[PDB]
Design an enzyme around this catalytic site. Structure first.
Site, short mmCIF file in Angstrom:
data_model
loop_
_atom_site.label_atom_id
_atom_site.label_comp_id
_atom_site.label_asym_id
_atom_site.label_seq_id
_atom_site.Cartn_x
_atom_site.Cartn_y
_atom_site.Cartn_z
N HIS A 19 -15.69 55.98 65.73
CA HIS A 19 -14.90 56.44 66.34
C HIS A 19 -14.96 57.26 67.32
O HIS A 19 -16.10 57.89 67.41
CB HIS A 19 -13.90 56.89 64.92
CG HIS A 19 -13.57 56.20 63.71
ND1 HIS A 19 -12.67 55.37 63.19
CD2 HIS A 19 -14.96 56.02 63.03
CE1 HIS A 19 -12.94 55.11 62.16
NE2 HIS A 19 -14.14 55.05 62.07
N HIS A 27 -10.52 47.12 66.92
CA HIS A 27 -9.86 48.55 66.57
C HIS A 27 -11.39 49.17 66.93
O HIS A 27 -10.84 50.53 66.79
CB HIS A 27 -9.98 48.32 64.89
CG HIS A 27 -9.07 47.64 64.17
ND1 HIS A 27 -7.29 47.92 64.43
CD2 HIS A 27 -8.64 46.92 63.43
CE1 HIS A 27 -6.72 46.97 63.45
NE2 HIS A 27 -8.01 46.73 62.68
N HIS A 35 -19.85 55.30 61.43
CA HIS A 35 -20.16 55.36 59.61
C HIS A 35 -21.17 53.83 59.52
O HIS A 35 -20.88 52.92 60.26
CB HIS A 35 -18.73 55.24 60.20
CG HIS A 35 -17.95 55.94 59.72
ND1 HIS A 35 -16.83 55.71 59.62
CD2 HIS A 35 -18.54 57.40 60.14
CE1 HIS A 35 -16.23 57.43 59.98
NE2 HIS A 35 -16.83 58.18 59.66
N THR A 88 -11.28 55.07 56.58
CA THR A 88 -10.11 55.78 57.39
C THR A 88 -9.25 55.08 58.10
O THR A 88 -8.56 55.68 58.70
CB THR A 88 -11.06 57.26 57.70
OG1 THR A 88 -12.11 56.14 58.49
CG2 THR A 88 -11.79 57.78 57.32
N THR A 89 -9.43 54.01 57.42
CA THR A 89 -9.07 53.32 58.31
C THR A 89 -7.63 52.38 56.74
O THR A 89 -8.07 52.31 55.96
CB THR A 89 -9.45 51.82 58.71
OG1 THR A 89 -10.26 51.04 57.98
CG2 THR A 89 -9.98 52.73 60.11
N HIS A 125 -19.87 51.44 62.99
CA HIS A 125 -19.23 51.67 63.97
C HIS A 125 -19.07 52.80 64.68
O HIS A 125 -19.29 53.77 63.69
CB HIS A 125 -17.51 50.76 63.23
CG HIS A 125 -17.65 51.28 62.22
ND1 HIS A 125 -17.21 50.73 60.35
CD2 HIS A 125 -16.19 52.47 61.94
CE1 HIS A 125 -16.78 52.35 59.81
NE2 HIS A 125 -16.04 53.13 60.46
N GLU A 128 -13.52 62.11 63.39
CA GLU A 128 -12.66 61.72 62.19
C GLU A 128 -12.96 62.87 61.43
O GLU A 128 -12.16 63.75 61.67
CB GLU A 128 -12.74 60.71 61.65
CG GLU A 128 -12.76 59.62 62.14
CD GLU A 128 -12.40 57.99 61.79
OE1 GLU A 128 -12.79 57.66 60.37
OE2 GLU A 128 -11.44 57.43 61.63
#
Ligand SMILES: [Zn+2]
Ligand SMILES: [Zn+2]
Ligand SMILES: [Zn+2]
Ligand SMILES: [Zn+2]
Length: 259
Positions: A95, A63, A118, A197-198, A93, A105
């Site tokens: 995005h 991911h 994040h 958010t996942t 991690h 995000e």
């Protein structure tokens, strides 16, 4: 059946089919509108205490990539601000997008950044991350925007290791990394109650989104895009656009730490 992802059949617009909380009352990310976010005098000073952080390893989880820390002690912690108690750093991690014009995000007045960092923390009220993520006050995520500009020296160790974890499940030792090098100078922030958010999208996160971005180069972000979502021996799927669209604020208020 098929595991969730960011692709055409398993990505964000479809997550509700397996995780109905996707349509919940406290979902993340959101747009931060700077005209309506309000200063909250009840917020205490925010303490980001990362002097003794012990990074261990970096993992491509299919991911994104997670840099994992030793969270056995009250050393690398977040305290103050909107938080009651002590929250231990477990991992960070990012995005990011398929091009520099999208990737974050959260948005600010509908504007997107090229990526978002994040830093994930859990409340030591609970025994560990797995217990905390089930609780409304369980997690605190420090979100930091990445804006394209000069290269960030604090990011270089991360981007240098990514070619060794190209496909899902690959990991590498990742030691002596200082996450303070990924922080902006100002810790002014917005905060609101939200969610992962996942998937599983649990509504267990106090979001603390810093107003000041960090600056990274286009070349550094492009290295993120050389990772792959797939495992070895499966058709190549570049790891890009691993972000969730912003979700309705509903009956929530975004508070500012600054007047
Ligand atoms: Zn699954
Ligand atoms: Zn506005
Ligand atoms: Zn997964
Ligand atoms: Zn995230």
């Amino acid at each position: 059946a098929h595991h969730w992802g960011y692709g055409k059949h398993n990505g964000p617009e479809h997550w509700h089919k397996d995780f109905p909380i996707a349509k919940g009352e406290r979902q993340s990310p959101v747009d931060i509108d700077t005209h309506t976010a309000k200063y909250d005098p009840s917020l205490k000073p925010l303490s980001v205490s990362y002097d003794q952080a012990t990074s261990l390893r970096i993992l491509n989880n299919g991911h994104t990539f997670n840099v994992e820390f030793d969270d056995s002690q009250d050393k690398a912690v977040l305290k103050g601000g909107p938080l009651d108690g002590t929250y231990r750093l477990i991992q960070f991690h990012f995005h990011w997008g398929s091009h520099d014009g999208q990737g974050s995000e959260h948005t600010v007045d509908k504007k997107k950044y090229a990526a978002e960092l994040h830093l994930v923390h859990w409340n030591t009220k609970y025994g560990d991350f797995g217990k905390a993520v089930q609780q409304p006050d369980g997690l605190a995520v420090l979100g930091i925007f990445l804006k394209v500009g000069s290269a960030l020296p604090g990011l270089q160790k991360v981007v240098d290791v990514l070619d060794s974890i190209k496909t899902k499940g690959k990991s590498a030792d990742f030691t002596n990394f200082d996450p303070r090098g990924l922080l902006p100078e100002s810790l002014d922030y917005w905060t609101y109650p939200g969610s992962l958010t996942t998937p599983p999208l649990l509504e267990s996160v106090t979001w603390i989104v810093l107003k000041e971005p960090i600056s990274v180069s286009s070349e550094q972000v492009s290295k993120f895009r050389k990772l792959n979502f797939n495992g070895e021996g499966e058709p190549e799927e570049p790891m890009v656009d691993n972000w969730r669209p912003t979700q309705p604020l509903k009956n929530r208020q975004i508070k500012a730490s600054f007047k």
